[PDB]
Structure 1
């Protein structure tokens, strides 16, 4: 029992991600500079927005990141 959304961000280090709560919107921004991988070189950037449900206080929204590279944003329901 709680609001929760998950996002696969394994291509981004925690420092390349920012989570912000603006009004009743959760904003997740990810950006990394050109980086070498198995296939060549790559840079990535995304901006994701979630609507916070009415029964969830935006002030109580927190987040966590797993060693899996999964970002979780969650909050208690009121």
Structure 2
């Protein structure tokens, strides 16, 4: 994954897821279953074993990483460019879609695609989360919680598609 351990891881585990069944298986037996997813849821348980876880974490897939203050998602990014990737929230998941073409060896022709979804552990706030893209094609998720903490309340809104710090 890486991140750390604890505590976170656990958370991661938781996120992862639961259912159981797965867881149951592982364990054993037982029973059953459961729871679932839704968102819220997340849861756890733890585981580891698964595978898924591984894938988540790492393986293939990619990778996940978890702290108290943030959960970070690092990708296994064979070349897509920063322009090909898109970020949005759906169903307590961070959604990613992409399409890229690349040159190789003894003449090929390549199309390359993916569509990813990643949950956040219960200490993570989905509404507050933001998600950004580095130059390798590597998404790395630093989404402000202003500092650390708890917020479980969440449900969807749109995230800015931004070039990344990490």
TM-score > 0.5 by shorter chain: yes
Structure-to-structure mapping, 1:53-64, within 5 angstroms: 53-64=121-132
Aligned to 1:22: 90
In structure 1, C-alpha distance between the alignment counterparts of 2:128 and 2:91, rounded to whole Å: 12
Could you say if the C-alpha distance between residues 55 and 62 of structure 1 is closer, same or farther in structure 2, counting changes exceeding 3 Å?
A: same
Aligned to 2:38: none
Q: Secondary structure at the match of 1:8?
A: coil
Instruction: Point out which structure has higher relative CO (alpha carbons under 8 A, 6+ apart).
Output: 1
Deviations along 1:25-53, one digit per CA (max 9) or x if unpaired, are 11111112xx3412222001111111121
Q: Which runs of 5+ in 2 are unaligned?
A: 1-66, 151-166
Q: TM-score, normalised by structure 1?
A: 0.76
Q: TM-score, normalised by structure 2?
A: 0.40
Q: Is residue 7 of structure 1 aligned with residue 59 of structure 2? A: no
**Native 8 Å contact 1:64 1:73 kept in 2:** yes
In structure 2, C-alpha distance between the alignment counterparts of 1:64 and 1:52, rounded to whole Å: 15
4+ residue runs of structure 1 moved beyond 6 angstroms? none
